[PDB]
Each structure stands twice: as C-alpha cells, then as structure tokens.
Model the fold of this input.
Amino acid sequence: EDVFEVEKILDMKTEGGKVLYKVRWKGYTSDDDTWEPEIHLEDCKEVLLEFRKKIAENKA
Amino acid sequence: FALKS
Done:
C-alpha cells in the first residue's frame, strides 16, 4: 500500500546527520518528490549509483 | 520499489 516504484535520484543532502536522496517516483510529478534515507534505497542501489555517477562526473 | 517517506 505504502511502497512505490522509484524512477531516479536527483539530489542528495545531509540533514542533522541524516543522508537523504531526492527521489523522483515513476509516474509522478516533481511536486511529489521526497527526500529518502539511503536505507529506503537498499533494494534499488543501481538507481542511487547512477545519480552518484552523475554528480561525480559533474564535479570534474 | 521503495517505501516513500
């Protein structure tokens, strides 16, 4: 009921020691993006890696 | 598939 399909990750921040990744949910608008802890992504690590590849390349 | 906060 409360589980949804991830599309891609588009940002990352640390908030009070919490590392959070901004998730774009498949089929939803950017108004529905949420900040998720890395633990919520442990089943879609490849999606997180694609985002980390981009930010490393953009630096660079 | 992920829990959405």
Notes: The domain at 1-60 of chain A is CATH 2.40.50.40 (OB fold (Dihydrolipoamide Acetyltransferase, E2P)). The beta strands of chain A are 3-4, 6-15, 18-25, 34-37. The radius of gyration of chain A is 12 Å.
